[PDB]
Amino acid sequence: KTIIINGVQFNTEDTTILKFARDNNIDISALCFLNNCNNDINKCEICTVEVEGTGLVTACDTLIEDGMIINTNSDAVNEKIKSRISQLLDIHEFKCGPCNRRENCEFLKLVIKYKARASKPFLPKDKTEYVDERSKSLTVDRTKCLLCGRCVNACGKNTETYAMKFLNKNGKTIIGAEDEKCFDDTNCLLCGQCIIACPVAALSEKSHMDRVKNALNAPKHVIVAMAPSVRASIGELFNMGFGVDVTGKIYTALRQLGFDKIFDINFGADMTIMEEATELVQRIENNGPFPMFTSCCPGWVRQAENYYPELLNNLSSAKSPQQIFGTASKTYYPSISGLDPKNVFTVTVMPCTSKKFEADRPQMEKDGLRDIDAVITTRELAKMIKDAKIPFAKLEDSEADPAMGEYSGAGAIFGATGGVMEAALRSAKDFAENAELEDIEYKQVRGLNGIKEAEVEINNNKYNVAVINGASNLFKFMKSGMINEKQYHFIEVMACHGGCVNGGGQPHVNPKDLEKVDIKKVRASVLYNQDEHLSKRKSHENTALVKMYQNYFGKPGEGRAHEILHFKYK
Ligand code: 402
Ligand code: SF4
Ligand code: SF4
Ligand code: SF4
Numbered sequence: 181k182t183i184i185i186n187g188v189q190f191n192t193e194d195t196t197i198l199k200f201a202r203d204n205n206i207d208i209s210a211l212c213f214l215n216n217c218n219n220d221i222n223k224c225e226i227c228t229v230e231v232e233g234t235g236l237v238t239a240c241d242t243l244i245e246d247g248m249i250i251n252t253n254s255d256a257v258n259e260k261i262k263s264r265i266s267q268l269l270d271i272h273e274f275k276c277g278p279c280n281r282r283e284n285c286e287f288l289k290l291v292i293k294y295k296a297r298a299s300k301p302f303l304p305k306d307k308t309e310y311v312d313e314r315s316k317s318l319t320v321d322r323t324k325c326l327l328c329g330r331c332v333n334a335c336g337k338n339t340e341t342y343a344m345k346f347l348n349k350n351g352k353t354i355i356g357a358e359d360e361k362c363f364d365d366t367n368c369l370l371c372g373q374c375i376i377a378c379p380v381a382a383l384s385e386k387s388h389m390d391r392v393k394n395a396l397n398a399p400k401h402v403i404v405a406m407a408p409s410v411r412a413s414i415g416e417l418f419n420m421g422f423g424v425d426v427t428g429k430i431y432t433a434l435r436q437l438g439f440d441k442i443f444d445i446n447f448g449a450d451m452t453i454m455e456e457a458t459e460l461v462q463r464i465e466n467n468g469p470f471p472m473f474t475s476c477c478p479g480w481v482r483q484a485e486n487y488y489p490e491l492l493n494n495l496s497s498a499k500s501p502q503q504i505f506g507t508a509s510k511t512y513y514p515s516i517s518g519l520d521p522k523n524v525f526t527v528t529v530m531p532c533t534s535k536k537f538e539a540d541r542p543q544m545e546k547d548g549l550r551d552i553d554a555v556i557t558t559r560e561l562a563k564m565i566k567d568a569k570i571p572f573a574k575l576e577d578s579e580a581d582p583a584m585g586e587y588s589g590a591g592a593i594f595g596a597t598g599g600v601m602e603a604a605l606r607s608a609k610d611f612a613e614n615a616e617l618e619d620i621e622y623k624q625v626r627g628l629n630g631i632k633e634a635e636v637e638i639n640n641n642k643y644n645v646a647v648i649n650g651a652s653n654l655f656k657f658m659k660s661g662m663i664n665e666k667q668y669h670f671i672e673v674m675a676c677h678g679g680c681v682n683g684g685g686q687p688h689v690n691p692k693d694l695e696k697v698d699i700k701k702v703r704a705s706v707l708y709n710q711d712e713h714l715s716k717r718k719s720h721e722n723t724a725l726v727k728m729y730q731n732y733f734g735k736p737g738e739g740r741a742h743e744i745l746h747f748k749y750k
């Protein structure tokens with residue numbers, strides 16, 4: 181094909197004008213196009229271009245054709261785009277100062293680019309009609325919503341629940357949950373993939389910043405611990421680029437924020453493995469029940485509760501790393517510090533919105549003490565650091581407090597799809613064989629395929645394992661009958677494609693950057709690199725963890741560990 185774009189000739193592909201332009205350093209804007217789909221109904225038309233002889237077309241869904249002459253920047257094109265943006269301003273409370281997307285908003289960028297102006301500024305006097313903060317995990321601010329459909333499409337594609345809907349409310353279109361219910365009261369997973377898809381501040385996480393501020397100000401001993409994924413991602417929000425390991429800077433920043441103890445959820449990950457690998461070995465000895473499923477992803481737990489309740493008894497009884505850590509923080513940690521358990525306030529930093537729901541489940545407490553008092557997302561921590569004027573990108577490295585802060589390489593990889601599986605197999609196989617095996621890499625469970633399997637030899641018998649990478653793939657695995665091609669023994673499920681590194685609490689990424697950078701792979705690489713360089717690569721070799729079990733919990737899977745570190749869903 182010979183195509184002319186802005187008077188420059190190209191000889192080439194069967195692709196859209198937008199993709200060809202993005203591949204050839206030609207500027208075309210876009211808004212509603214994401215995840216390979218636009219808002220098929222009510223298209224934004226921000227990607228308008230002129231095709232000579234045809235007229236104005238949407239570049240995001242128009243294929244190039246031999247002989248095409250395209251102009252991306254004529255007066256007629258720019259006036260059309262400007263008009264569409266102006267119409268969006270008419271429904272948009274354009275008040276960026278206090279907005280939680282001020283630094284990385286796709287809409288502000290477009291307003292500036294086209295010098296767009298509302299025909300009538302939208303100045304709602306009462307936000308309460310527009311705001312839904314009922315959920316434990318998600319919030320909606322419809323004063324910001326462009327009705328671009330990105331969230332609806334992302335929910336459908338990533339989860340297949342269609343829990344995010346277009347709704348007709350009083351003759352007007354909104355997005356929201358089924359019947360405009362609180363999300364939590366629907367089949368929604370609370371995974372936040374809708375948030376990640378949103379170009380503006382319309383969808384957000386339910387804030388826990390109040391909880392944290394108040395605890396830090398209460399003369400309370402405030403512990404903080406971050407998830408695996410945070411250290412592979414938060415630097416994105418400090419202009420550091422992608423794939424940067426910022427672990428040591430985070431520890432320094434958390435001390436500067438005034439936390440009293442700097443621990444790490446990866447220590448909790450090693451605890452989960454102690455319990456869960458022990459359980460797997462028991463199920464092997466007992467001839468089942470099989471399969472055992474992981475229980476550490478709250479989004480998956482809700483998927484099982486909402487769609488597959490017959491599987492709940494097959495979930496591992498080990499608490500998630502977050503909850504198992506929290507339980508220990510109110511029991512073990514007082515025993516080594518002298519703190520009154522009631523005065524410990526435990527904060528986690530997570531790449532996840534569904535972790536807020538998990539932490540707030542009524543039974544996730546003992547003796548009146550919550551396992552976890554507050555959960556802030558990666559985004560919330562970045563805001564806290566910025567509000568404190570901490571110069572994150574140039575901080576010196578520090579280390580965690582060791583007693584609940586050391587982690588093995590097995591715990592380090594939890595945030596990638598297949599990480600829990602690999603970590604668990606490293607311990608299970610030693611436990612079942614009563615041996616110290618040098619070969620610990622399970623590359624067959626790694627990477628971005630939607631469903632992954634492997635056959636593993638454990639103590640001279642073959643077992644089948646599966647890794648389900650994303651909620652939509654759980655539905656595929658079940659509905660297709662794949663779960664029945666063989667007897668599966670152990671199955672990891674993550675709700676977010678890529679695992680937690682791509683969770684709903686993570687930094688937003690510009691659609692153009694997503695096309696240039698494989699965010700799932702690049703964030704995960706930080707974690708696998710840590711494992712490669714850690715002196716301990718098995719959870720049961722974490723020295724601080726060994727001390728905690730030796731001194732306090734006893735043997736995994738029994739005694740005090742069974743009594744308090746487990747949770748079953750009825
Ligand atoms: N709890 C817990 Fe997990 C651990 O460790 C996180 O913190 Fe995850 C991450 N990153 C999240 O959110 S949850 C699911 N399993 C994989 S990783
Ligand atoms: S969503 Fe974007 S354009 Fe709207 S107020 Fe927030 S930062 Fe400004
Ligand atoms: S939290 Fe997840 S399941 Fe719920 S609407 Fe958003 S994308 Fe869909
Ligand atoms: S909530 Fe966000 S992604 Fe969903 S339609 Fe509104 S602006 Fe678009």
Ligand code: SF4
Pocket residue numbers: 370371476477478479480531532533534535674675676679680681682683684685
């Ligand atoms: S995969 Fe990770 S970030 Fe996503 S819902 Fe599950 S625990 Fe949360």
Ligand code: FES
Pocket residue numbers: 209210211212213218219223224225226227228238239240241
């Ligand atoms: S980006 Fe093409 S119609 Fe919205």
